[PDB]
Amino acid sequence: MSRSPDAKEDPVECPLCMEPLEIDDINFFPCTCGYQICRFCWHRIRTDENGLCPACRKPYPEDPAVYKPLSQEELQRI
C-alpha cells in the first residue's frame, strides 16, 4: 500500500549459529573483516578457542592474546 520500492527491512541473523541479532549485536563482530557472530558464538571462540577469525584467520581486535606493535626487533640488550 505504498509507492516506494522498499517499504520494509529485515533484521540481521547470526550466520554462525542462526539467531536474532540484538541492536548492539548488529555490528558486534570479533573481527573487522565482516565475519560477525552473536554473543553465544563469540563466548565460545574467545573461550575454548584461540579467539581467532575462522573466516580470515586474524586475532579479534580487542587484545586477544597479547598484541605487539614493534618492540625490540634485534634485541640489542647489553
Contact status, residue 54 vs residue 33, Cβ threshold 8 Å: no
Q: How far is the CB of 39 from Zn ion (least distance, A)?
A: 8
Which residue type sits at 55? A
Counting contacts by CB under 5 A, is residue 45 touching Zn ion? no
d(CA 31, CA 45) in angstroms, rounded, equals 12
Counting contacts by CB under 5 A, is residue 41 touching Zn ion? yes
> Which residue in 43, 44, 49, 56 binds Zn ion (CB under 5 A)?
56
- 8 exposed, middle or buried (CB, 10 Å; 0-12, 13-18, 19+)? exposed
Q: Footprint of Zn ion on residues 11-40 (CB under 5 A)?
A: 14, 16-17, 31, 33, 35, 37-38
C-alpha dihedral, 42 to 53 to 28 to 17, nearest 10°: -50
Stretch that binds Zn ion, among 6-14, 20-28, 44-52, 64-72 (CB under 5 A): 6-14
Which residues form the interface with Zn ion (CB under 5 A)?
A: 14, 16-17, 31, 33, 35, 37-38, 41, 53, 55-56, 58
